[PDB]
Amino acid sequence: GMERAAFGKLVQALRREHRDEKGRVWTQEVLAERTQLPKRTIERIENGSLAHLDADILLRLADALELTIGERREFFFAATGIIEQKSATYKRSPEESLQYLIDMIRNMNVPAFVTDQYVNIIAANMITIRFFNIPMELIETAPLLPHGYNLMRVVFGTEYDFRRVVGTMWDEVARHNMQLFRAISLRVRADGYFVELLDNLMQYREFKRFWERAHLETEDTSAENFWYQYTHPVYGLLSYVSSRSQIPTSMGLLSMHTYIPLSPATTDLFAKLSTVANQDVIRLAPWPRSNG
C-alpha cells in the first residue's frame, strides 16, 4: 500500500501522461469528466485529503486512466493495501541484497541480470553480454543518457537493434516487455527521475507505438515467464524461457532475470558462452539510484 499523499501524487502523474482529443495534457477537470466524479473529489485524491477511497472511485480512475491489467493490480493495491503499524523489516540491507543477487548471477551458467524499480539494468553476468552481443562502446556511453541503462532502451532503442535479433517474434517480445515495464514502474510513476526517463523513452517511435497500444491487451504476461522460440540470425534455432524474481529492499525492489535453456542447441550455446574467459558480473546503472 501507499500513504494518501503519495497515492495522490501517483494519480497526478498518471493523469499527466495523457493527452486528450485536442492533444492537451489532461487536467483535473478532464479526469473528473472521464470518471463522472466531481473536480473537488479529483482535487482531494491528488492532495491526499480523502481518507477513504471506495471501489467505485478506484475502478472509475483505473478505467479512465486506461491502465494495463498489470497496472490495475498495482494501482488498486497502492490504494487499498493495509500499511502495518511497524515499518517493514529485511534480513539484508539494500547493499547486501544487491550483492546477494550479484553473487548468485556470477555463479549461473545461463544469461542473468538485475533490474530495479525503474527497470534500469543494475548488473549482468558476462554470459548476458556475450549472448546479446552488446557493443562495449554502447555500455561505455550509457552513463551519458538518463535512459542509458534502461531495459526499454535495449528493447526499443535505435543504438542496439533488438528487433533484428528476435525478428518475426518482435511484436510479441515488445508487447511483453512493455507490459513488464508498465506494471513494474506503476508505483514510482510520480518520481521525478521516472518522468525524465519516460520523456526520453517517448522519443523512440517504436516505444510510443507499443506504449499507446498496451491497454488494448486482454491477456496479461507481466507476472509470467516468457517462452522464446525463434531462429536467431546468428545462433540459429533457440528455445528458452525468461523468468523474473523480485526481492524487496528498504530502497525499492530488485528483480532478477534468468534465461533457462529448453533445447539441446540452446543448452550447448549457453554452456559455450559460460566457458569463454570466465564467470564475472558487469556493474551497470548505479544502485540505489538516489541513495537517500
Ligand SMILES: CCCCCCCCCCCCCC(=O)O
Ligand atoms: C546498454 C546498457 C545495458 C548493457 C547490457 C544489458 C544486458 C541486458 C540485456 C537485456 C535484453 C532483455 C530483453 C528480453 O529478453 O526480452
Ligand SMILES: [Cl-]
Ligand atoms: Cl547478435
